[PDB]
C-alpha cells in the first residue's frame, strides 16, 4: 500500500506474495480460529480499502463467510452514509466532497481519487473505518463458528484441570461480550461446570481469586496417573 | 518495531511474515519449553510495545497461560503507576506529559503516541520494561509447566544415569533460583538421586571434580555402572 | 553484533531470524557432530559476546552438554582472570578499564559497556577470545559424544574399504590429539584394523603409497575385499 | 570475503547463511557429482582463502574423500615454493611479505595480513590459484567416485540410443584428456560401442555427419533401431 | 513426623539437627519454609498448608500452639 517517510512522499506499493501465501495456508490449517483477527489488524500497514479488499477477493472454500462479511460491510457503509453526519450538496471545484459510504468501497472508487482523499487533504480515517468493518464482520464469523454456547464446556470425573481450562478458553475467545460481565461470569461458571472433587478443592480458595492464583493452586491437582487430593 | 540507522533516524516498520510464521511454529511445537525464552528475546527486536502486543495475540494453543502472562503485565503496569515516579499530573503546554503505568500497554495507547515519547525527546525504557514484564510472564509460565520437584527427580533401576542428567537439567531450567544456591545444591544432588548400581562406581570420585569431570567418567562407563548392548 | 565501516560509524545490529532458524535446525539435526563447530565460526560475524552467548541459550534436549560448555567458558575466563596478566582496581580517571574474567562473561557484563570497550580505546580481542573459548568447549563435547577407540574400528567380513575408512574419518574429527603422532600411527592402523580379505592387498601395496594413491588403488578391487592376487 | 566497489573501498564480511545451508544441502543431494565443481566455482565469488577454508571445514558425509584434497593442495603449495617465484627471507621496512606455500591457507595465516598481501601492492592471484588447486583435487575426487570408465560403456540389445548416449555423456564429464584428443574419441567411441542394429543406422549415415545430424537420425529411426534395415 | 507425633517435638528435633548444619543463613532459612510442611504428617501438613505463605516464626508457632494433639482429622476425606 502507500508507504515512504524519511525519504519523502508516499508511493503505492503492491502486496507481498509471502503474505498472500500465509493467508491461503492459515485457512487450510485453522480456517475460522480467533487468532486471524489480530494478525490481520497487525499486518495491514497503510490499510487502503481496495488493497484490503484483495484479501477478501482471494478467498477460496470460505467464500460463504466472505459473502456475509460483504453484506455487513454494505450495512455499515449504509449506516455511515445516512445515520452519521450526511454529505451536503454542490461545492466549489477541487474539494474531495466528503466521501460517501459507496466511496469507501473498492467497486465504486478509483485509485487516483481514493489515494487523493487519503493524503492530499489532511488524512481521513477511510482505511481505518473499512478495516474496522472487516474486524466487525470477522467477529460475527467466529461467534457463529463456535460449536459451544460458552456454558457447554464441562469437566468429567477423569478429565484434568489443564484440559478443562484449554476447552474453556477455546470457547471464551469467541464470546464477543463486555469485559466486566465476562470477568463476573468467568468467576462463577468455572466453579459451576467443574467436576465434584475438583470443585470441592476449588471452593477452598474462595472470593478474590485471580488466574495466577488459580493456576498456582491447581499445580497440586496435577495430571494423568496422579490422583488429585485436597491434601 | 522501530528500525533504521544508515539512512538516518528510526522509523516504525512491521516484522517479516517468515518471522511471524517461525514464531507460530515455535509456539505450536515448543509450547512451554524454557528454550522459547531466548527465542522470544531475540525476536522482540527494537523497542515499540505495539508489535510485541500483537505477536502474543497469535496463539491458538495455550491461550490460558498467555492470558496469565497478560494479567502479569497488567499488574506490573499497575506498579509503574504507583511505586515508580509518575509525577504530579498537570503539566505546562509544549510537553509530551510523560506516560502513566497503563499508558505503556499497546491496548491503551495509540501508535503515533507510543512512538512520540521515545522519538520526539531522548529515550525512555518503555520497550525494555514492557519486554521485562513479558519475560517475567514467560518465567511464570515455565513455573506452572513443571509437574515434579527436584527431589522427586529420582533415577529408576533400569534407567541410565545419562537420561537422568538430561531430565535434571531440563527440570532445573524452570525452577527460578539464585546461581549460588543452584551450584551449592549441585555438589550433593547429582549423586543423591542416582540409583545404587551406578553409585557403586560414581561414589569413588569424591569431593571436587566438576560436572565436566563427573560426566567424562560417566561417559567412559555407561549404563548402571557398566554399559549394555542392543544388537 | 557490530557492523559498518565504509558506510559510516559503527552500528550494533541484530542477527536475521533466518540465521537463528538455520542455527536451530543445525543444532537439532546434527547435535554433537564436529561439523557444527566451523559453522558456528562462519555464522558468528563481528564477534560480540552477548550475541555469542544468545546462540548458546536456544538448545532443546541437550542442555546438559551446553551447561558443561558454559562452565568451560567460566574455566577459561578464570584462566584469563588470574594466569593471564592480573589487573589492579586503581586506574586513572577517563579510562575504560580493561576487562577482568567476569567482565568477558555474559553474566556480569552490560551490552552498552561491552560495545563501548571494543569501540573506544585500541582494539581488545574480547569477542575472538570468547569465540575461541566456545570452540574449545565444543571440542570437549565431541570427546563426550565419541563412543569408540583406535582399535575398536575394525573392518568386518562383509564390509568394504569405503565403509571402513568412513568410520575412521568420522572418529578422526573428535580425536583431539597431535597431528604429527596421528600421521605416523595411521600407516600402521590402516593395515592393522583391516579384514583378512582386504588386508593382504593393503600389505602388498606397502610403503610409498599416500592417501590418494591408496584410495586410487582401493577403488578398482571390488566388494568386501575381492581376489587380491590377479594371476 | 572483501566486498564493495560502487560505494568505495571493500569491507570484509562473512559468507551469507543461506549460501552455507545451500552448500550443506547440495552435498546431501549430490556430493561427488561432476556438476558440483562448476556449482562451487559459481558460489565462490571473492576468493578470499579464509572464506574458502570454511567451505572445506563444513563438509558432512564425504570427509575421508575430502581430506585427500588437502594432500593435493599442500603438494601444489610445495610447487608454488619451487616453480613460481620463491623470493627470499630478508625483508625491508613496512612490507606485506609475498606469500609462501603455507601462507596461502587460512589455517596457517592471519586474516588482516591475508587481506594486506591480496590488496596492498597490485592484486596477487592467491584466490585464483587456491581455487584451481581445489579444482585439481575435485577432479581427483570424481576419479574416486567413478563406477564406470569411458571404455567400459557399451550399448546392450534392450538399451535405446537416448539411454546409451546419456551414460556416455555422464562418463565424458570427467574425461581427463585434451580437447583435441576428445574430438577423436567422440567420433570413434560413439559408433564403436553402439549395438549392431544401432550401428547399421550410423554405418548408413556415415562420414560427414554432425552431432546434430546423428541425433536427428537417431530421433527419426527410434530406439536403438529394430530387427530389419530401414536404410 | 509420625502419625501420632506432635509438632513441638518434631520442630525441636528439626531445629537441633539444623543447628549442626554450619551453612549460610540463606541456605537454612529458604529450606525451612518448605521442608517442615513437606515432611509433616497428612493432618499436620493440612494445617500447616492452611496457614500457608507469608507470616513470621512467631505467627507460625502461635498457629501451631492452638491446633493441639498430633493433628485432629477432617471431613472432606
DSSP string, D44-83: --S--HHHHHHHHHT--TTHHHHHHHHHHHHHHHHHHTTT
CB burial readout B118-142, b (16+ within 10 A) else e = bbeeeeeebbebbbebbeebbebbb
Beta strand C11-12 pairing with D2-3: unpaired
Stated as kind and residue range, the H or E segment containing E65 is helix E57-67
Experimentally, the structure was elucidated by NMR
Name the one residue in this structure whose C-alpha cell is 537422568: B164
Name the one residue in this structure whose C-alpha cell is 569424591: B206
CB burial readout A50-76, b (16+ within 10 A) else e = bbbbebbeebeeeeebbeebeebbeeb
Residue C230 CB partners (closer than 8 Å, separation 6+):
none
Most B CBs within 10 A among C68, C102, C136, C142, hence the mutation to make, goes to C68
The whole-angstrom separation of Cα A73 and Cα A67 is 10
User: φ and ψ at B6, to 5 degrees?
Assistant: -55, -45
Helix, strand or coil for residue D88? coil
In this structure, are C143 and C155 located in the same domain?
no
Sign of the alpha-carbon dihedral angle for A55, A60, A61, A66 = positive
Contacts of A39 in chain B (CB under 8 A): 20, 54, 58
Helix, strand or coil for residue C200? helix
Beta strand residue intervals within chain B, DSSP E: 2-3, 11-12
Of C103, C120, C147, the last residue of a domain is C147
Residue A173 CB partners (closer than 8 Å, separation 6+):
A34, A142, B63
The whole-angstrom separation of Cα B19 and Cα B51 is 12
Contact D5, D44 (CB under 8 A): no
DSSP state, A16?
A: P
Contact D4, C6 (CB under 8 A): yes
User: CB count, 10 Å around CB of D138?
Assistant: 19
Of A128, A147, A166, the last residue of a domain is A147
Of D147, D165, D196, the last residue of a domain is D147
Please report whether residue A9 resides in a domain: yes
- Provide the domain count of chain C: 2
Please report whether residue E53 resides in a domain: yes
| Residue A159 belongs to domain with CATH number | 1.10.1200.30
Contact B169, C64 (CB under 8 A): yes
Contact D230, D214 (CB under 8 A): no
Stated as kind and residue range, the H or E segment containing A215 is helix A211-217
In this structure, are B124 and B166 located in the same domain?
no
Chain C adjacent subunits, 3+ CB pairs under 8 A: B, D
CA distance C20 to chain D (A): 10
Please report whether residue C228 resides in a domain: no
Please report whether residue B212 resides in a domain: yes
Sign of the alpha-carbon dihedral angle for B79, B80, B85, B90 = negative
Please report whether residue C130 resides in a domain: yes
Name the one residue in this structure whose C-alpha cell is 492452638: E66
| Alpha helices in chain D, H assignment, sequence order | 17-30, 36-43, 49-57, 63-80, 111-119, 126-145, 161-171, 179-192, 196-205, 211-221
In this structure, are C154 and C67 located in the same domain?
no
In this structure, are B159 and B140 located in the same domain?
no
The whole-angstrom separation of Cα D207 and Cα D210 is 9
CA distance E46 to chain A (A): 6
Burial (CB count <10 Å: 0-12, 13-18, 19+), residue A155: buried
Q: Is E27 on the interface with B (CB under 8 A)?
A: yes
Q: Do chains E and D touch (3 or more CB pairs under 8 A)?
A: no
CA distance B59 to chain A (A): 7
Contacts of A166 in chain B (CB under 8 A): 62-64
Residue E11: give the domain boundaries. 1-67
Contact E50, A204 (CB under 8 A): no
CA D84 to chain centre: 23
The whole-angstrom separation of Cα C150 and Cα C168 is 8
Q: Which residue of D has its CA nearest to C8?
A: D7
In this structure, are D3 and D99 located in the same domain?
yes
Long-range contacts of A165-168 (CB under 8 A, 24+ apart): A165/B64, A166/B62, A166/B63, A166/B64, A168/B64
Burial (CB count <10 Å: 0-12, 13-18, 19+), residue C139: middle
Contacts of A169 in chain B (CB under 8 A): 63-64, 67
In this structure, are B54 and B118 located in the same domain?
yes
Name the one residue in this structure whose C-alpha cell is 454494505: A74
Amino acid at each position: 500500500p502507500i508507504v515512504q517517510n524519511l525519504q519523502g512522499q508516499m508511493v503505492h506499493q503492491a502486496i507481498s506474495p509471502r503474505t498472500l501465501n500465509a493467508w491461503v495456508k492459515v485457512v487450510e490449517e485453522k480456517a475460522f480460529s480467533p487468532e486471524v483477527i489480530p494478525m490481520f489488524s497487525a499486518l495491514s500497514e497503510g490499510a487502503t480499502p481496495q488493497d484490503l479488499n484483495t484479501m477478501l477477493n482471494t478467498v477460496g472454500g470460505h467464500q460463504a463467510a466472505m459473502q456475509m462479511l460483504k453484506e455487513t460491510i454494505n450495512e455499515e457503509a449504509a449506516e455511515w452514509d445516512r445515520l452519521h453526519p450526511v454529505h451536503a450538496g454542490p461545492i466549489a471545484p477541487g474539494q474531495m466532497r466528503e466521501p460517501r459510504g459507496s466511496d469507501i468501497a473498492g467497486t465504486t472508487s478509483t485509485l487516483q481519487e481514493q489515494i487523493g482523499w487519503m493524503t492530499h487533504n489532511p488524512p481521513i480515517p477511510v482505511g481505518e473505518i473499512y478495516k474496522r468493518w472487516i474486524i466487525l464482520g470477522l467477529n460475527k464469523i467466529v461467534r457463529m463458528y463456535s460449536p459451544t454456547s460458552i456454558l457447554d464446556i464441562r469437566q468429567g470425573p477423569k478429565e484434568p484441570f489443564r484440559d478443562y481450562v484449554d476447552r474453556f478458553y477455546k470457547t471464551l475467545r469467541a464470546e464477543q461480550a463486555s469485559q466486566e460481565v465476562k470477568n463476573w461470569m468467568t468467576e462463577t461458571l468455572l466453579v459451576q461446570n467443574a467436576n465434584p472433587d475438583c470443585k470441592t478443592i476449588l471452593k477452598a480458595l474462595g472470593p478474590g481469586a485471580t488466574l495466577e492464583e488459580m493456576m498456582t493452586a491447581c499445580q497440586g491437582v496435577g495430571g494423568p496417573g496422579h490422583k488429585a487430593r485436597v491434601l
